[PDB]
PDB file of C-alpha atoms in Angstrom:
ATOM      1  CA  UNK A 260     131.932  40.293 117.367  1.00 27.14           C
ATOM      2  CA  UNK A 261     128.285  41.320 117.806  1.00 23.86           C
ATOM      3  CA  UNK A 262     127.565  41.823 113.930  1.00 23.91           C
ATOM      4  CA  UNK A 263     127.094  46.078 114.036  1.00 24.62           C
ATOM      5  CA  UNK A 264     128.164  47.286 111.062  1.00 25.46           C
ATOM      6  CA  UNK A 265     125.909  50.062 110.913  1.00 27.37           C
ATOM      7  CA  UNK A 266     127.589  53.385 113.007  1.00 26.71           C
ATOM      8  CA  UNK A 267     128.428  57.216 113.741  1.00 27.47           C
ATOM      9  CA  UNK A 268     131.080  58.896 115.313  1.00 24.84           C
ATOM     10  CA  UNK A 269     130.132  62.186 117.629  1.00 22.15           C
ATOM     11  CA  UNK A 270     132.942  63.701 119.208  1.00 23.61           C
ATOM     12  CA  UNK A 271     133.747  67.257 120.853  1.00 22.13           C
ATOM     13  CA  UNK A 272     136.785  69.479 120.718  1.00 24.49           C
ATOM     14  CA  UNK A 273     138.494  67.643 123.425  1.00 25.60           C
ATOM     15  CA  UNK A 274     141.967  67.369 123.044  1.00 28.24           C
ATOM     16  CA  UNK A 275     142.915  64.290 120.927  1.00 27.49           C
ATOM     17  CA  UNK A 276     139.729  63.584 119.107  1.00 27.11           C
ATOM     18  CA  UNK A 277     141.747  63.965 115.765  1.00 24.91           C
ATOM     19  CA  UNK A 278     143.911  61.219 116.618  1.00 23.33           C
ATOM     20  CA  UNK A 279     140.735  59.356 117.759  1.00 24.23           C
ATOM     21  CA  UNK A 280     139.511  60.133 114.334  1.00 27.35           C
ATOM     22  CA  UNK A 281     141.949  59.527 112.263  1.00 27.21           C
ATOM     23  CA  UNK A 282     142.482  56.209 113.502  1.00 28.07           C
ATOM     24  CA  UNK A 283     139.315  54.925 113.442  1.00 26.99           C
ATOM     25  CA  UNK A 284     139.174  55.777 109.628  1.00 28.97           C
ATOM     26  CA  UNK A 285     142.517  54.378 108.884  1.00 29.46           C
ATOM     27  CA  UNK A 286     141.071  51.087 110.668  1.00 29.98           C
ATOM     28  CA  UNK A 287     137.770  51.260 108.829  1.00 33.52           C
ATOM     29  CA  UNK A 288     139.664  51.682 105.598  1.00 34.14           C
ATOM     30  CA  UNK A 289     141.613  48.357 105.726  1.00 35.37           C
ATOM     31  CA  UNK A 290     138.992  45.610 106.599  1.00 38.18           C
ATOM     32  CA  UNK A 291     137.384  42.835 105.376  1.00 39.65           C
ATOM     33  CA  UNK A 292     134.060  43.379 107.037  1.00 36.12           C
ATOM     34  CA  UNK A 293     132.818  46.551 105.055  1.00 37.14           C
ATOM     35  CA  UNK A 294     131.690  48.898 107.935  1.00 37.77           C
ATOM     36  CA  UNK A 295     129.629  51.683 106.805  1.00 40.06           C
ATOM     37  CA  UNK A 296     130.308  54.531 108.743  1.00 37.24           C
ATOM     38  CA  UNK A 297     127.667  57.069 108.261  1.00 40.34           C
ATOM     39  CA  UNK A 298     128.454  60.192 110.024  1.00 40.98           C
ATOM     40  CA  UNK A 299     131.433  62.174 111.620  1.00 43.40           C
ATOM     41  CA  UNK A 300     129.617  64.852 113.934  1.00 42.36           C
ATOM     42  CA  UNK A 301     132.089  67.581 116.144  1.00 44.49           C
ATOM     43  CA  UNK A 302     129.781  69.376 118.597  1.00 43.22           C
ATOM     44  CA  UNK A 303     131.750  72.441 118.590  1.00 43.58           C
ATOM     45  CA  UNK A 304     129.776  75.409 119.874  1.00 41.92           C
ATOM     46  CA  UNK A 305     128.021  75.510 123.942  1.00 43.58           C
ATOM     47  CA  UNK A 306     124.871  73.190 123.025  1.00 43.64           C
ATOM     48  CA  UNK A 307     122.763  76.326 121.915  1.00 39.44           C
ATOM     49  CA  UNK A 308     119.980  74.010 120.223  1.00 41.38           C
ATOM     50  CA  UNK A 309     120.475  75.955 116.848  1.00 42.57           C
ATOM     51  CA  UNK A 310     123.264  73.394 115.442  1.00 41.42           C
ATOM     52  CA  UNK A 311     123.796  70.497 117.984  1.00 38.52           C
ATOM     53  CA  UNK A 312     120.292  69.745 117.745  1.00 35.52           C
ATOM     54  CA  UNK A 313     120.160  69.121 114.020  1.00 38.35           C
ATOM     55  CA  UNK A 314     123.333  67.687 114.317  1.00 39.53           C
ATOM     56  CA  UNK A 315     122.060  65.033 116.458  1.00 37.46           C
ATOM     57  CA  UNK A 316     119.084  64.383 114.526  1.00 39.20           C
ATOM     58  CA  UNK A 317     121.204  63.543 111.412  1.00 39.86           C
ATOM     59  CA  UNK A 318     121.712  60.284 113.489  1.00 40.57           C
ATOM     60  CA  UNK A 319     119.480  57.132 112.989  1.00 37.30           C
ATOM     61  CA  UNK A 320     121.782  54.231 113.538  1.00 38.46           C
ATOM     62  CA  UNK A 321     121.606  52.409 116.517  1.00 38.61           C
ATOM     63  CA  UNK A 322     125.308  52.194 117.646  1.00 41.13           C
ATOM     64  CA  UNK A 323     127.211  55.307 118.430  1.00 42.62           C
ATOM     65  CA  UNK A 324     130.731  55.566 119.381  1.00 45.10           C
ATOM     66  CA  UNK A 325     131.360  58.828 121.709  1.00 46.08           C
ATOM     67  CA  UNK A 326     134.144  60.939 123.138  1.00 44.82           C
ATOM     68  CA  UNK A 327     134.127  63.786 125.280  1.00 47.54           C
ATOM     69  CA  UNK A 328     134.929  64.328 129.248  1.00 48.44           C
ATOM     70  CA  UNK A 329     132.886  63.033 132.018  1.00 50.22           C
ATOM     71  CA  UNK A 330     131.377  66.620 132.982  1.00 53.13           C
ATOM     72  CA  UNK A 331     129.789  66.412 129.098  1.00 49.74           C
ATOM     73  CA  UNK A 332     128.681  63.137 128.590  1.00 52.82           C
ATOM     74  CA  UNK A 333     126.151  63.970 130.950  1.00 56.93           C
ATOM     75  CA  UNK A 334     125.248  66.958 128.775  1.00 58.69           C
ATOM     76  CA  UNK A 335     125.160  65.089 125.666  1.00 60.57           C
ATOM     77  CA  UNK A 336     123.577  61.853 126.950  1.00 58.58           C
ATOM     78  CA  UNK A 337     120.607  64.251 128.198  1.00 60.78           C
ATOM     79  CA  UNK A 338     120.274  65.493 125.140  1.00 61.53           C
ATOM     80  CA  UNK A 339     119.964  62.818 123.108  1.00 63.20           C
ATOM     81  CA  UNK A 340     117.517  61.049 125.924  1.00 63.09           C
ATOM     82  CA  UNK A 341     115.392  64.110 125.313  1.00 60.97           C
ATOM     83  CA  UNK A 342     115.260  63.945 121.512  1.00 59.84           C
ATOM     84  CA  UNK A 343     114.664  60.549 121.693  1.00 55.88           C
ATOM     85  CA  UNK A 344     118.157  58.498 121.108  1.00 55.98           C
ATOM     86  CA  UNK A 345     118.261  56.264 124.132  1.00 56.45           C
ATOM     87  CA  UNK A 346     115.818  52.900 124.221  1.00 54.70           C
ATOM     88  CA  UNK A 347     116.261  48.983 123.939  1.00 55.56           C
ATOM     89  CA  UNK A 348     117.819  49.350 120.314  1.00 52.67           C
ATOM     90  CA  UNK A 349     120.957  52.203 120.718  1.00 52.18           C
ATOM     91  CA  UNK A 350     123.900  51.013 121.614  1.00 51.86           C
ATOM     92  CA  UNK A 351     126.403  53.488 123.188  1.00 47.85           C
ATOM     93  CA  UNK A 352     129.923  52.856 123.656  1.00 45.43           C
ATOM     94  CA  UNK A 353     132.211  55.081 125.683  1.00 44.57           C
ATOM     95  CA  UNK A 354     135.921  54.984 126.294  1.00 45.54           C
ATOM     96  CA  UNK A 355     137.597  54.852 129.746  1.00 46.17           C
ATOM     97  CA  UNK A 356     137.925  58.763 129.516  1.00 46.08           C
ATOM     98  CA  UNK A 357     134.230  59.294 130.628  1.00 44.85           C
ATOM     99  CA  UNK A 358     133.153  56.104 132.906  1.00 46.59           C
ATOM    100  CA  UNK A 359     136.021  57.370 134.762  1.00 44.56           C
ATOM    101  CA  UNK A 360     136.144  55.972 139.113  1.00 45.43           C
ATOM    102  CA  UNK A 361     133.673  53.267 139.288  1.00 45.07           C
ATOM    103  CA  UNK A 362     132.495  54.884 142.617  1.00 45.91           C
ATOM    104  CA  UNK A 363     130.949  58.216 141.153  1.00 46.08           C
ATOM    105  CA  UNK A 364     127.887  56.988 138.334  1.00 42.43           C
ATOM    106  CA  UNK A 365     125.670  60.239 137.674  1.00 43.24           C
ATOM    107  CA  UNK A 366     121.882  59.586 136.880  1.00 43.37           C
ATOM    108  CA  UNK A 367     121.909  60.869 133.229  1.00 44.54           C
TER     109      UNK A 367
ATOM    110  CA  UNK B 263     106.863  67.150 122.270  1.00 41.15           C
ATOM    111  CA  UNK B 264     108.496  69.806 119.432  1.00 42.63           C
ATOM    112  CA  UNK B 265     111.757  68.081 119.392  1.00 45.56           C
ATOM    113  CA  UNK B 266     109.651  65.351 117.365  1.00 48.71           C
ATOM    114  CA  UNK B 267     108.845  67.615 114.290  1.00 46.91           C
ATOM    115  CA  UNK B 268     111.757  66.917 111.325  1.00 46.04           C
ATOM    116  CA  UNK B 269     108.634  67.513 108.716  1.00 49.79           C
ATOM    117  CA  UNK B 270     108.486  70.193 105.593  1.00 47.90           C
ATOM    118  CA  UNK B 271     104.584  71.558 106.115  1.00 47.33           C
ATOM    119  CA  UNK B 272     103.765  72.690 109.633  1.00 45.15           C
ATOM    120  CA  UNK B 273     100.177  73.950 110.571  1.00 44.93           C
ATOM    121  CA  UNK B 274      99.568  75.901 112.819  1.00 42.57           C
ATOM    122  CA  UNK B 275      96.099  77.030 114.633  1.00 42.54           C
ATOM    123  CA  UNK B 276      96.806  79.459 117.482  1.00 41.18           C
ATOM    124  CA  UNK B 277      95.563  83.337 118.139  1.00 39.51           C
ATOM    125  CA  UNK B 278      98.557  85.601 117.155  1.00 41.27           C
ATOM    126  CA  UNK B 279      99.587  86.513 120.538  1.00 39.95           C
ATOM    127  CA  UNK B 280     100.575  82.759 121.089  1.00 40.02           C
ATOM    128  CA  UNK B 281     101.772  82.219 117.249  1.00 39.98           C
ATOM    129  CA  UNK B 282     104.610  84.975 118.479  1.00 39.93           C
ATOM    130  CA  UNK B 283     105.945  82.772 121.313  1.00 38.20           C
ATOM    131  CA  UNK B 284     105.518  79.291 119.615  1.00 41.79           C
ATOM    132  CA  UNK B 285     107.164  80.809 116.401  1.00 39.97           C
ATOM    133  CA  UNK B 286     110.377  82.058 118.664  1.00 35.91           C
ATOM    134  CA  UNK B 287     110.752  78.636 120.325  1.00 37.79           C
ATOM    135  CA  UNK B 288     110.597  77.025 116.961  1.00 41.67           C
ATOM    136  CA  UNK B 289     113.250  79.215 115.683  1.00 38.53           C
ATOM    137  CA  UNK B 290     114.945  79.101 119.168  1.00 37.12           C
ATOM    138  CA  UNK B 291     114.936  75.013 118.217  1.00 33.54           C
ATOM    139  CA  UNK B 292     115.840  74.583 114.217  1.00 34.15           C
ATOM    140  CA  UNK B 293     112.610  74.289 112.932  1.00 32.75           C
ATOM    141  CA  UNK B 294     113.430  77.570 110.404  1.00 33.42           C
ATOM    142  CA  UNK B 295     115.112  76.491 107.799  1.00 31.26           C
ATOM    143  CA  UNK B 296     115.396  76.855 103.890  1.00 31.72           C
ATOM    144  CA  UNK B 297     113.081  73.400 104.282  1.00 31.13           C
ATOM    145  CA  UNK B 298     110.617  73.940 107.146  1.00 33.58           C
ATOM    146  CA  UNK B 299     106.970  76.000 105.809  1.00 33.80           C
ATOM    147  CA  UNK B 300     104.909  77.460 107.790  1.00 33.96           C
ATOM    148  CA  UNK B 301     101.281  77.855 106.768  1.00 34.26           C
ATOM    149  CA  UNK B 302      98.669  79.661 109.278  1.00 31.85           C
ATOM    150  CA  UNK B 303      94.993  80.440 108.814  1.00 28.33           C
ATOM    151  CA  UNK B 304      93.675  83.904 109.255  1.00 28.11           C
ATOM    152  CA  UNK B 305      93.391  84.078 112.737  1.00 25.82           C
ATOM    153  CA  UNK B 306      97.416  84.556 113.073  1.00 24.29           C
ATOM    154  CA  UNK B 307      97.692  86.918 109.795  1.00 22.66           C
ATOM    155  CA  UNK B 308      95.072  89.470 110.852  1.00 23.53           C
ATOM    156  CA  UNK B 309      95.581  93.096 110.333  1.00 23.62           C
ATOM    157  CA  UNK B 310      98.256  92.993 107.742  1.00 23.12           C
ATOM    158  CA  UNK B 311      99.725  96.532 109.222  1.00 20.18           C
ATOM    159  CA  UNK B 312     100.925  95.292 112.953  1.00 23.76           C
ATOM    160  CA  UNK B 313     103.883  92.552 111.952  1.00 21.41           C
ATOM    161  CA  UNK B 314     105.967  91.649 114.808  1.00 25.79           C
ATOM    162  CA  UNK B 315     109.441  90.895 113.682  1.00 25.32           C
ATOM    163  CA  UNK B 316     109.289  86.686 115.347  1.00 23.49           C
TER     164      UNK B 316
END
């Protein structure tokens, strides 16, 4: 509904992210609009800077779709603040996993 | 400030003492790759006996 057709896909070894995966391609596969999904990251070792952090510079879209618990997100969204990934243009989009009870908002 | 760096061709300028420690954070970061090169003057490559293993 807001015309971006341009996106990744960076998700950790939580439990269900193959399901998540799966049927997000499935949905991509059988539309009209023509997305053009660029990437399909897994963060799977402890953030040691030696593979996440080319990982994460592979991206240069502007809308990211991410999934991982609440106690990462805050590890990944400093991250990507730090190499540069968070302005006016990036979109993020997060699923209810994460931005969890509306009381507790962490400053990352 | 290094996270910025995705180049091929890095110089450097820095005695050897430093080159050591900004070498391991570069490794310590990606920057070592088949693509990266590294090109110093001869300040950092000086006595070609003493070569530290960074």
């Amino acid at each position: 509904d807001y015309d971006w057709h341009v996106f990744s896909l960076v998700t950790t070894i939580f439990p269900g992210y193959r399901d998540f995966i799966s049927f997000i391609k499935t949905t991509v596969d059988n539309s009209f609009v023509g997305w053009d999904m660029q990437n399909v990251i897994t963060l799977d070792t402890s953030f040691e800077d030696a593979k996440t952090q080319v990982q994460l510079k592979k991206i240069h879209s502007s809308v990211i779709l991410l999934y991982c618990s609440k106690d990462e997100a805050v590890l990944i969204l400093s991250e990507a603040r730090s190499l540069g990934l968070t302005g006016y243009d990036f979109f993020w989009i997060v699923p209810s996993l994460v931005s969890g009870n509306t009381e507790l908002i962490p400053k990352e």
